[PDB]
Write a protein that binds this ligand. Structure first.
Ligand SMILES: CCCCCCCCCCCCCCCCCC(=O)OC[C@H](COP(=O)([O-])OCC(O)COP(=O)([O-])OC[C@@H](COC(=O)CCCCCCCCCCCCCCCCC)OC(=O)CCCCCCCCCCCCCCCCC)OC(=O)CCCCCCCCCCCCCCCCC
Ligand SMILES: CCCCCCCCCCCCCCCCCC(=O)OC[C@H](COP(=O)([O-])OCC(O)COP(=O)([O-])OC[C@@H](COC(=O)CCCCCCCCCCCCCCCCC)OC(=O)CCCCCCCCCCCCCCCCC)OC(=O)CCCCCCCCCCCCCCCCC
Ligand SMILES: CCCCCCCCCCCCCCCCC[C@@H](O)O[C@H](CO[C@H](O)CCCCCCCCCCCCCCC)COP(=O)(O)OCC[N+](C)(C)C
Ligand SMILES: CCCCCCCCCCCCCCCCC[C@@H](O)O[C@H](CO[C@H](O)CCCCCCCCCCCCCCC)COP(=O)(O)OCC[N+](C)(C)C
Ligand SMILES: CCCCCCCC/C=C\CCCCCCCC(=O)OC[C@H](COP(=O)(O)OCCN)OC(=O)CCCCCCC/C=C\CCCCCCCC
Ligand SMILES: CCCCCCCC/C=C\CCCCCCCC(=O)O[C@H](COC(=O)CCCCCCC/C=C/CCCCCCCC)COP(=O)(O)OCCN
Ligand SMILES: Nc1ncnc2c1ncn2[C@@H]1O[C@H](COP(=O)(O)OP(=O)(O)O)[C@@H](O)[C@H]1O
Lengths: 98, 459, 347, 320, 49, 122, 56, 104, 55
């Protein structure tokens, strides 16, 4: 692989680690989710363009579509959470235990 | 042998279709008829077994056990109907259903030709017993007892299943005939040692072996009367039957492997007999006596000689009958005085003479008075052990003393002395209880009249 | 929520599962997972309260992370071989990513923490749906890619699932959490035999689904979500508690009940290869699940707990809504062992 | 067909049946006041279904046959022994209060189900929103403990939140001495032992908690004793109310569907009455529970489902 | 004797009863015919008769 | 591990290929079919019990439908299971026939020529 | 008058009928294991002029 | 209430001899109890016990003991008359046994 | 000493003690997503290192 491929995979790893490590806000973790989606889009586009897979050129667009759904879903949940507590802090999602 | 299996499955809907005041009569009559039918299995051959089909076979080792089970069912029916009088009709039918299912499972267990079917039935016997103990027991510890009865068994039997399937991947069959005919020696390796332990420890925990016996006092004390009868009479003999079956594939690894179990059994018979000398509960004494006798049977199976096998068979049948009779005897007094303390009710020979005669006969048969089959089995086992090593006569001898002591001790504590003054509700014995005692005791002496019927296949 | 909207959402969840199950393209499988999650989120929030919202949020976060890892694995596999078909997974790193993502989706240990919380936060119907229908798609993909699996990783996760399920369920008084921990342990059992025989996985999944459906339908029939709530049922419907006890016996794995059939067969299969130690450990660990099933049976059926006065009024009314498939489910979850060889029809 | 999601999907919608006279009405007042006569008159003039006050045996009249059952199998409480010995050590007072609250909840569910199924109005004497005053009168007199009040509050909190308050609350005000004189003239030997402190506590509970807090949900029609006999005047006052302030106008068709599914299936209504909180006044041991349940199942029309008891003349059972 | 309608009346729901009985008889007839055809087809393929 | 999914000539969702018509059908008195009917009867009884009806007498048409449905499903289930086992045996025998080197039939020795170690019990 | 007697005591034929059915099933099972009938080296025998099988 | 719940008092045990001085201890219904006693005594002692013992006592000799005795008498007679040893240490003919070629 | 104490201490009581302790350890989680998502990160790294690097 070239340096670009490892750079994109490194960005994906950074975004995954950022989501997995929460600080306080749910919006920051949602942003990390969108970052992972963006890195996946870039990597898939590079792989498809490099190998000249013509019919696969539409797959990244489809990816983006479902990405939007995820984003919307998250935002919806965020609203409800805030309406319960006045803050989007993940410390308040502790009514259920193991 | 469906001619015995189908009538029990017909006992089921007969019980569930009976009138509210006729369940006991129908169940008792048809259980007795089934026992009479099963009596035909005693006509055994001298060379091979009665191979009924691809699934079921009757050997000289299993026929007396089947007869004992089918005979025990009416006795449990008679014993249970006293303390279940206030129970509703549906729950009485459920109790009878549990007893019938247990008998069906035992009947199918004692005749399965394959080892895996034997395992499935010998494990299916757990559910009705646990339900009976934990639902119709009297005190609060019964729940705990149920747990001790369950996991103690399963922790021993889960490895066996693994071993079983492993064997079928190596030899290609679990049929007992093919297993016997195509037997091969076991080498001395760690894999074979652990295969031996997996094949043996389930039956060891079922007997139970000393140190693995803690479930038995709890389960046999907390269970109702019918539960105690079936636990002491038949369910303990599953371990012995399974061990006698499975030892055919463990040679010659058995000589090296048996030592710890032999020492455990001998020192444990001594220890349990000694424990019986200081027991304030009447049911716990009988439970520990059962442990001692089963330790003797373990030694007999483990030394692996023909005389030892005959002794094991005779002792198993004799102990089943004797322990059931003793548990019923104790339950009569418990139903009178609603307590299990042995020194609470004394001098009962003054108030209940025929009941004291039954107590005397049961205690005499417990200590193996000749020429009862108890003594026949005990003496055959002792002779085999003496051939195995002349020093065993020490430990066995000590047992023969201590046993007698506690047996007579029990009698002397309950029947002799002076009656307790403030206990003024000792009603005269009923016909049901006397008939239960007589139906327990007469087959024992009748069997003494013809002992080759309970001496097993090695005869 | 409108009944039409609820029906549409349930159909969308089912359609996502079937899209995963009928596809030959990795993109279509990922799309099926996406659609299933999107339609599943509102089903968890059908009855609105803060606990349901928290459960839905946790479920969404977990499933989104798992789906992103799934997409990454697919992209890496495409990079090292321009293949989109669901097949032997030509790259090992992509296969590790796939195994971890599917384990997170299934709730396998150590990605198990979300299952008890989500199950406790939602209603009994949503819990039924989550613990029965939501297992099909990841297990189907795992069955399809079984040849290239790394046995060490899945066997580790399966053993951890069994251990953690038993230990966690040992401590629960809430019925939904007990069901969640049982689900984790059964997931471990199904994934332990996957590298050796997928037919055993399918059989175990079917038996577990039947048992779970019967259990959840009995819990819906008597409106109990706690042990103490279920301890009142004998004073209202004793037949329900009796059937509950036999169902718990079957789920415990005791012969001759049907719950014995999968484990038995799985053990046998693992002894057709060498694999002796793992089945022994798995059975010894399943004894814990048996223990807490037995404790529940003690609380609900084998003893009678004290009741309340107002229960008398409940004696005068009957159950309006009746589940038509409950008797068949109970019978299949208890009396099916003699039909064991019929499993040959599965392959 | 039974009402459910299918009936709502096609056709059936509740909001079309409401014809400006839905109007759940409750008429409150102290003991021995003539609220029952006023309720009957209001129902007769407005053409609404009248519901007599829910007593100990209200549930028996709605199931099986309408005949009441034995107090041991139904209620397990006595009002007469509450009057005789309000401080009994067997917890009769709170047991009676709890059973009465459960009966009122069942009656409210029945009235709501009738209104939503037919569109016809209903008139009630007391409601779950009015019961608490009696409880307060029990607590201030030392008749019940504080834990009883806490359990009552828990059950009320989990139950009364799932229904709608009445449209119009009618109150009849009678002075305590007049109540005592009416009780004296009535002649029932048990009500003679009601002290003036009990009635005073009921009156303070009403006038300080019930009316002030029910005035926020909807307007309250208060009538003195003298202006309660003219039922036509009260009815014509009711016909000229502007009801646009409560939760009722803000109810669309889906919430009506949910409420209609809740009011039927009375087991769902009564679910939280028997929460596993173990107060000695209402907790029953396993042996007595078993005995009483077995006794209940032996009643002539109770062992099986309503249509499957052949001992009360049910035919063709083997084809149902 | 019921205070309510008790929608299940003294007579059964004849439509549902007839549908159930008809389904049972149709299933039994189909099974018998299928078994007959299977036996004939097997005998033809293996050439017994 | 999937053994039979990739077997050549397999129709995806057939459940009963034409080749299975070459096997004898299960008898209508097959004990497995009788057990399936028993399962249907048990389902009917439990259905009566749950709904608080006379268990043995409530609905004869419902119980008949239960038994019939269970028998009807069991017949085809047994057909497919027998077909699968026949396929397994056929494939096994063909593979053994086509690979003689892997399955050699070596010389048979009488027990008068094999030395077996004797382990005395004493 | 026997209607009541039968409706009370009809449960007393289930067990004998089960026993007879079990005997019949045992005979049917015996019928399927005749592959070595009159063929063992120990009991091989020339048939009598009239009999067809040595055992059923 | 100083109590924990509402319970029935523990009932006293009923004595069967109070209503039926000749009770047999089987049931509270005198006729049902008498017939229970009758069936137990008839089918336990009269049918199973005595007839079963008679059946077992006369069980035909399938263990083949008399046959073995007669065969032993025949063999002993022949061997004693012909001068052969009564029993041989080998139960299998050595002509049919092939020992290994080399023992070194 | 033997039956009521030590035979009880070794087999059943030790097993019960160990199972109860492990149950308390496993099920004592506060329900905060932060902690076990950190655990997820640790698990992913360990699985990438131990199993994925050895193929
Ligand atoms: C040897 C004699 C031969 C006689 C031939 C005929 C014998 C027929 C006996 C039938 C079976 C015995 C009955 C057992 C059940 C109890 C019945 C009962 O309720 O009695 C009340 C009844 C009515 O009296 P009651 O006024 O109501 O009094 C009630 C009070 O409670 C007052 O009650 P009680 O104080 O009278 O108590 C009853 C009494 C007696 O009750 C019992 O204890 C019965 C049980 C005896 C001991 C059982 C444990 C030992 C097991 C040995 C097994 C042997 C089996 C042989 C085959 C038997 C088949 C049934 O107790 C004793 O006297 C102590 C018994 C000590 C026995 C020691 C024997 C050692 C072995 C003897 C040799 C045996 C082999 C001989 C051949 C040897 C080689 C030549 O009294 C009697 O009927 C008499 C009792 C019978 C005594 C016979 C003892 C010897 C016979 C042994 C069994 C039969 C063997 C037959 C072959 C020959 C031997
Ligand atoms: C292996 C060989 C073959 C055996 C197969 C396995 C066993 C059989 C299959 C199992 C399923 C069959 C029955 C299922 C429905 C049962 C539901 C029920 O409640 O029954 C009550 C019902 C009585 O109710 P009712 O008449 O409406 O009036 C009384 C009230 O209902 C009053 O009722 P209630 O509700 O007021 O009473 C409350 C009571 C009610 O609670 C119960 O009744 C418990 C019933 C639970 C059913 C079992 C669960 C599901 C099946 C699994 C079985 C496991 C087997 C494996 C071994 C493990 C053992 C657990 O609950 C309690 O009191 C709690 C007590 C705690 C005890 C815990 C033990 C329960 C588990 C026992 C299961 C044993 C197997 C089933 C035995 C049959 C039971 C009737 O029983 C019956 O009348 C039906 C049973 C007999 C029908 C078949 C007879 C056919 C016609 C006769 C002629 C025979 C033809 C022969 C052919 C040749 C021509 C001559
Ligand atoms: C606890 C009891 C469990 C029972 C489970 C539910 C039973 C009822 C469900 C009815 C099943 C409907 C199927 C019949 C419609 C025809 C569909 C048919 O074409 O399916 C074929 C296959 O038929 C089905 O698989 C057979 C289902 C039979 C299930 C019963 C077996 C249970 C094991 C033994 C338990 C006892 C059963 C008792 C029955 C009441 C497709 O074959 P194929 O596409 O190539 O395989 C896909 C999977 N592969 C490729 C990975 C292999
Ligand atoms: C109350 C007062 C009591 C005192 C008064 C009593 C009066 C006298 C009565 C006592 C009789 C004395 C007995 C003396 C022995 C005579 C009987 C003996 O000779 O018969 C034996 C025969 O006895 C029977 O074989 C033993 C009885 C069988 C026992 C089976 C028990 C019945 C089943 C019940 C269920 C069992 C459950 C336990 C399962 C194992 C001989 O055996 P055998 O050498 O061959 O016979 C050779 C000739 N044959 C072979 C042609 C017949
Ligand atoms: C590696 C993993 C190995 C898995 C071993 C499985 C062990 C199977 C038994 C599990 C029992 C667990 C019991 C437990 O942990 O709870 C402690 C429990 C607390 O009581 P609860 O009912 O939970 O609470 C009620 C009041 N609040 O303490 C008790 O009293 C338990 C009493 C009954 C248990 C008795 C178990 C007897 C089993 C003995 C032999 C089992 C050995 C198993 C391993 C065999 C060796 C290979
Ligand atoms: C209440 C008390 C009950 C508890 C008693 C349970 C203990 C039972 C004894 C252990 C059984 C484990 C063996 C399982 C079946 C073995 C079958 C077998 O033959 O497998 C061997 C392999 O043997 C094993 O793998 C066994 C290893 C043991 C793993 C599990 C350990 C369990 C605990 C061991 C110590 C317990 C000692 C007995 C209990 C003492 C009482 C407390 C051969 O396999 P191959 O790999 O093909 O070898 C040939 C080619 N190399
Ligand atoms: N929740 C309650 N608690 C205690 N007593 C009640 C309760 N509800 C009604 N009662 C009793 O019902 C009796 C008469 O009821 P009331 O409605 O005031 O008279 P009327 O039937 O003429 O309308 C009174 O003695 C009153 O105490």
């Amino acid at each position: 692989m070239p340096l670009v491929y490892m750079n994109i995979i490194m960005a994906f790893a950074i975004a995954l680690a950022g989501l997995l490590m929460y600080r306080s806000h749910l919006m920051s973790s949602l942003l990390c989710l969108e970052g992972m989606m963006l890195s996946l889009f870039i990597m898939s586009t590079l792989i498809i363009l490099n190998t000249h897979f013509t019919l696969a050129n539409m797959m990244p667009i489809i990816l983006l579509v479902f990405a939007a759904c995820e984003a919307a879903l998250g935002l919806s949940l965020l609203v409800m959470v805030s309406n319960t507590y006045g803050t989007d802090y993940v410390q308040n999602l502790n009514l259920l235990q193991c | 042998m469906l001619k015995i299996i189908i009538p029990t499955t017909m006992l089921l809907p007969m019980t569930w279709m009976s009138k509210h005041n006729m369940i006991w009569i129908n169940a008792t009559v048809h259980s007795l008829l089934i026992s009479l039918i099963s009596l035909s299995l005693l006509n055994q051959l001298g060379e091979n077994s009665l191979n009924f089909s691809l699934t079921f076979f009757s050997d000289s080792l299993s026929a007396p056990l089947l007869v004992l089970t089918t005979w025990l069912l009416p006795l449990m029916l008679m014993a249970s109907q006293s303390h279940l009088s206030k129970e509703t009709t549906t729950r009485k039918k459920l109790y009878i259903t549990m007893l019938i299912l247990l008998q069906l499972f035992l009947i199918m267990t004692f005749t399965a030709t394959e080892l895996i079917l034997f395992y499935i039935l010998f494990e299916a016997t757990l559910v009705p017993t646990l339900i009976i103990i934990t639902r119709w027991g009297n005190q609060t510890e019964r729940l705990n007892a149920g747990l001790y009865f369950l996991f103690y068994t399963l922790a021993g039997s889960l490895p066996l299943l693994v071993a079983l399937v492993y064997i079928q991947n190596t030899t290609g069959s679990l049929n007992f005939l093919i297993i016997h005919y195509w037997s091969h020696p076991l080498s001395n390796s760690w894999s074979n040692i652990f295969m031996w332990l997996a094949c043996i420890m389930a039956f060891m925990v079922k007997m139970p072996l000393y140190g693995l016996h803690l479930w038995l006092p709890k389960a046999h004390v907390e269970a109702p009367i019918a539960g105690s009868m079936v636990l002491a009479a038949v369910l303990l003999k599953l371990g012995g039957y399974g061990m006698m079956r499975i030892t055919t594939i463990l040679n010659p690894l058995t000589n090296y492997m048996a030592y710890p179990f032999l020492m455990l059994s001998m020192w444990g018979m001594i220890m349990t007999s000694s424990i019986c000398l200081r027991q304030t509960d009447l049911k716990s004494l009988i439970a520990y006596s059962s442990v001692s006798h089963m330790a003797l049977v373990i030694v007999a199976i483990m030394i692996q000689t023909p005389w030892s096998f005959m002794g094991a068979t005779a002792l198993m049948i004799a102990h089943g009958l004797t322990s059931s009779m003793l548990f019923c005897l104790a339950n009569t007094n418990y139903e009178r005085v609603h307590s299990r303390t042995m020194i609470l009710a004394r001098g009962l020979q003054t108030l209940l003479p025929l009941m004291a005669t039954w107590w005397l006969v049961a205690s005499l048969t417990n200590l193996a008075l000749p020429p009862s089959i108890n003594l026949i089995g005990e003496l055959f086992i002792i002779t085999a052990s003496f051939s195995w090593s002349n020093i065993t006569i020490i430990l066995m001898g000590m047992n023969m003393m201590i046993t007698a002591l506690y047996s007579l001790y029990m009698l002397i504590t309950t029947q002799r002395g002076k009656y307790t003054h403030h206990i003024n509700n000792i009603k005269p014995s009923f016909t049901r209880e006397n008939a239960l005692m007589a139906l327990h005791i007469l087959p024992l002496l009748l069997l003494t009249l013809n002992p080759k019927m309970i001496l097993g296949p090695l005869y | 929520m409108n009944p039409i909207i609820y029906t549409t959402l349930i159909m969308t969840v089912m359609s996502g599962t079937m899209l995963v199950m009928i596809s030959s393209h990795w993109l279509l499988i990922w799309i099926g997972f996406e659609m299933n999650l999107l339609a599943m989120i509102p089903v968890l929030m059908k009855n609105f309260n803060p606990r349901a919202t928290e459960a839905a949020t946790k479920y969404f976060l977990t499933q989104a992370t798992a789906s992103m890892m799934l997409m990454m694995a697919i992209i890496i596999n495409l990079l090292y071989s321009g293949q989109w078909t669901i097949t032997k997974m030509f790259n090992p790193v992509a296969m590790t990513m796939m195994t971890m993502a599917l384990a997170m989706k299934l709730g396998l240990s150590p990605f198990h923490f979300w299952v008890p919380e989500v199950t406790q936060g939602i209603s009994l119907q949503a819990g039924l749906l989550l613990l029965t229908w939501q297992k099909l798609a990841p297990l189907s993909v795992l069955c399809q890619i079984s040849q290239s699996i790394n046995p060490n990783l899945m066997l580790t996760m399966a053993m951890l699932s069994i251990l953690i399920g038993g230990w966690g369920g040992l401590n629960q008084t809430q019925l939904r959490k007990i069901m969640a921990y049982s689900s984790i342990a059964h997931m471990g059992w199904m994934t332990a035999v996957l590298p050796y025989n997928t037919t055993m996985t399918i059989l175990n999944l079917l038996i577990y689904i039947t048992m779970t459906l019967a259990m959840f339908m009995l819990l819906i029939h008597s409106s109990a979500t706690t042990t103490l709530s279920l301890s009142h049922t004998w004073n209202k419907m004793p037949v329900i508690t009796s059937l509950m006890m036999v169902t718990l016996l079957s789920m415990g794995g005791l012969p001759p009940l049907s719950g014995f059939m999968p484990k038995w067969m799985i053990i046998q299969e693992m002894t057709k290869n060498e694999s002796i130690i793992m089945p022994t450990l798995m059975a010894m660990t399943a004894l814990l699940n048996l223990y807490f099933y037995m404790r529940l049976a003690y609380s609900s059926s084998l003893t009678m707990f004290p009741s309340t006065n107002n229960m008398k009024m409940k004696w005068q009314f009957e159950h309006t809504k009746q589940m038509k498939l409950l008797p068949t489910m109970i019978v299949l979850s208890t009396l099916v062992l003699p039909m064991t060889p019929a499993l040959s029809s599965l392959n | 067909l039974q009402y459910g999601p299918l009936a709502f999907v096609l056709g059936e919608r509740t909001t079309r049946k409401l014809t400006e006279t839905s109007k759940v009405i409750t008429v409150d007042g102290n003991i021995c006041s003539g609220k029952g006569r006023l309720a009957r008159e209001i129902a007769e003039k407005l053409g609404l279904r009248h519901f007599p006050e829910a007593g100990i045996h209200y549930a028996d009249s709605t199931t099986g046959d309408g005949k009441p059952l034995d107090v041991q199998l139904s209620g397990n409480c006595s009002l007469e022994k509450f009057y005789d010995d309000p401080k009994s050590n067997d917890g009769n007072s709170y047991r009676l209060q709890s059973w009465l609250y459960a009966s009122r909840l069942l009656q409210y569910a029945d009235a709501l189900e009738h209104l939503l199924s037919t569109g016809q109005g209903v008139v009630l004497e007391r409601s779950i929103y009015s019961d608490f005053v009696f409880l307060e009168a029990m607590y201030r007199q030392g008749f019940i403990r504080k834990q009883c009040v806490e359990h009552y509050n828990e059950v009320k909190k989990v139950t009364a939140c799932e229904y709608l308050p009445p449209h119009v609350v009618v109150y009849v005000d009678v002075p305590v001495p007049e109540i005592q004189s009416r009780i004296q003239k009535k002649g029932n030997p048990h009500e003679m032992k009601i002290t003036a402190a009990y009635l005073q506590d009921i009156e303070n509970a009403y006038k300080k908690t019930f009316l002030p807090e029910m005035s926020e949900k909807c307007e309250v029609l208060q009538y003195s004793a003298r202006e309660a006999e003219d039922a036509e005047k009260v009815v014509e006052d009711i016909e000229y109310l502007k009801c646009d302030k409560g939760p009722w106008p803000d109810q669309d068709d889906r919430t009506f569907h949910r409420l209609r599914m809740l009011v039927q299936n009375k087991l769902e209504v009564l679910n939280y009455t028997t929460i596993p909180v173990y107060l000695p006044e209402i907790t029953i041991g396993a042996h007595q529970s078993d005995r009483v349940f077995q006794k209940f199942t032996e009643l002539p029309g109770r062992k099986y489902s309503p249509g499957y008891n052949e001992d009360v003349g049910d035919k063709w059972i083997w084809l149902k | 004797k019921f205070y309510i309608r008790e929608p299940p009346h003294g007579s059964p729901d004849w439509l549902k009863v007839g549908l159930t009985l008809g389904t049972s008889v149709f299933l039994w007839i189909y099974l018998i015919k299928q078994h007959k055809e299977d036996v004939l087809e097997y005998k033809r393929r293996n050439g017994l008769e | 591990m999937t053994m039979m999914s990739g077997r050549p000539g397999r129709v995806p969702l057939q459940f009963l290929p034409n080749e299975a018509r070459s096997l004898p059908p299960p008898k209508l008195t097959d004990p497995r079919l009788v057990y399936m009917g028993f399962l249907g009867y048990c389902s009917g009884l439990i259905d009566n019990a749950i709904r608080r009806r006379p268990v043995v007498s409530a609905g004869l048409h419902r119980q008949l439908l239960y038994v019939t449905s269970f028998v009807f499903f069991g017949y085809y289930l047994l057909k497919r299971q027998d077909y699968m086992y026949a396929l397994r045996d056929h494939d096994m025998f063909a593979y053994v026939k086509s690979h003689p080197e892997d399955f050699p039939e070596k010389d048979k020795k009488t027990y008068g020529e094999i030395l077996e170690e004797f382990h005395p019990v004493r | 008058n026997v209607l009541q007697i039968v409706r009370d005591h009809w449960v007393h034929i289930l067990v004998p009928v089960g026993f007879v059915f079990g005997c019949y099933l045992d005979r049917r099972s015996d019928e399927k294991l005749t592959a070595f009938r009159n063929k063992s080296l120990l009991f091989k025998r020339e048939l009598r002029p009239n009999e067809e099988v040595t055992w059923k | 209430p100083t109590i924990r719940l509402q319970e029935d008092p523990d009932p006293e045990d009923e004595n069967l001899y109070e209503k039926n001085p000749d009770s047999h201890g089987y049931d509270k219904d005198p006729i049902v109890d008498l017939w229970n006693m009758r069936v137990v005594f008839f089918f336990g002692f009269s049918i199973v016990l005595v007839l079963g013992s008679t059946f077992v006592a006369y069980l035909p000799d399938y263990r083949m003991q008399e046959w073995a005795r007669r065969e032993a008498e025949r063999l002993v007679k022949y061997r004693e008359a012909n001068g052969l040893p009564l029993m041989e240490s080998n139960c299998f003919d050595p002509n049919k046994i092939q020992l290994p070629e080399d023992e070194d | 000493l033997l039956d009521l104490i030590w035979l009880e201490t070794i087999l059943p009581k030790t097993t019960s003690f160990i199972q109860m302790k492990m149950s308390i350890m496993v099920s004592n989680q506060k329900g905060l997503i932060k902690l076990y998502f950190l655990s997820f990160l640790i698990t992913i790294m360990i699985s990438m290192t131990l199993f994925n690097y050895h193929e």
